[PDB]
Design a protein around this ligand. Structure first.
Ligand code: GNP
Ligand code: MG
Lengths: 34, 159, 34
């Protein structure tokens, strides 16, 4: 099923605050898979 | 394949963006911020943060800077003020990183200009006092561009 | 003028596409932080 969970991009309409969250989560995901 | 997060800082117009573009896209005129390279036989993945010359404080910008593992501190060899400003950037980096020992490389850019106001010895001296390497670059001719970034990766690996 | 927001990478993006997107997002967020 799953290992580290891949975050979903919060969308084309996302706020900067949502993207800042996504940026951290995606950093963590990509580091967790390495 | 190890990932490195590199950050480029320095005064307005020193050539931070031109250096990044030359590294990634291999050209110069007068978006990708990632490159796969092979340093000393080792495959490395570089992400580059190309910062702004005009400082503006924000908590979020500091957070983006803290992600950096190594910093290029860039001045232009025909802009003494940008050379004097290097101290500002170095101290800001130690502060964001809350460390006295952050991987850094001093970069003197625009070395294609015969008319310079900062001499090689002046810059080598400063770098010596910091205990960091000095590399001369020209984003224009591509002189030293790979060398500056690869040397930063070697600096990170001294940690 | 103004920073280009990178487009969402897509739910089935490759790890390399996510990495490329992440580096772009890092720079975008840095630029727009106000
Ligand atoms: N001759 C020469 N011009 C250069 C070199 N690097 C950059 N330039 C020129 O210097 C100017 C500023 O370059 P730029 O890449 O925008 O610098 P910056 O440090 O990113 N500026 P900013 O702080 O505003 O983001 C441009 O005209 C650019 O072409 C170089 O090595 N040689
Ligand atoms: Mg720039």
């Amino acid at each position: 099923g799953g290992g580290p969970r891949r975050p979903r991009x919060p969308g084309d309409n996302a706020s900067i605050k949502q993207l800042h969250a996504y940026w951290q989560r995606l950093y963590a995901y990509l580091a967790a898979v390495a | 394949m190890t990932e490195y997060k590199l950050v480029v800082v320095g005064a307005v117009g020193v050539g931070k963006s031109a250096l990044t573009i030359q590294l990634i896209q291999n050209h110069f005129v007068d978006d990708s911020y990632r490159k796969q390279v092979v340093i000393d036989g080792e495959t490395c993945l570089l992400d580059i943060l190309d910062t702004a010359g005009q400082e503006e404080y924000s908590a979020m910008r500091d957070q983006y800077m803290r992600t950096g593992e190594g910093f290029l501190c860039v001045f232009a060899i025909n802009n003494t003020k940008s050379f004097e400003d290097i101290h500002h950037y170095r101290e800001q980096i130690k502060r964001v990183k809350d460390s006295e020992d952050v991987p850094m490389v001093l970069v003197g850019n625009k070395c294609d200009l015969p008319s310079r106001t900062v001499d090689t010895k002046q810059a080598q001296d400063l770098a010596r006092s910091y205990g960091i390497p000095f590399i001369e670059t020209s984003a224009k001719t591509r002189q030293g561009v790979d060398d500056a970034f690869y040397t930063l990766v070697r600096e990170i690996r001294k940690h | 003028s103004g920073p280009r927001r990178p487009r969402x990478p897509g739910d089935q993006a490759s790890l390399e596409e996510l990495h490329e997107y992440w580096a772009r997002l890092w720079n975008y967020l840095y630029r727009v932080a106000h």
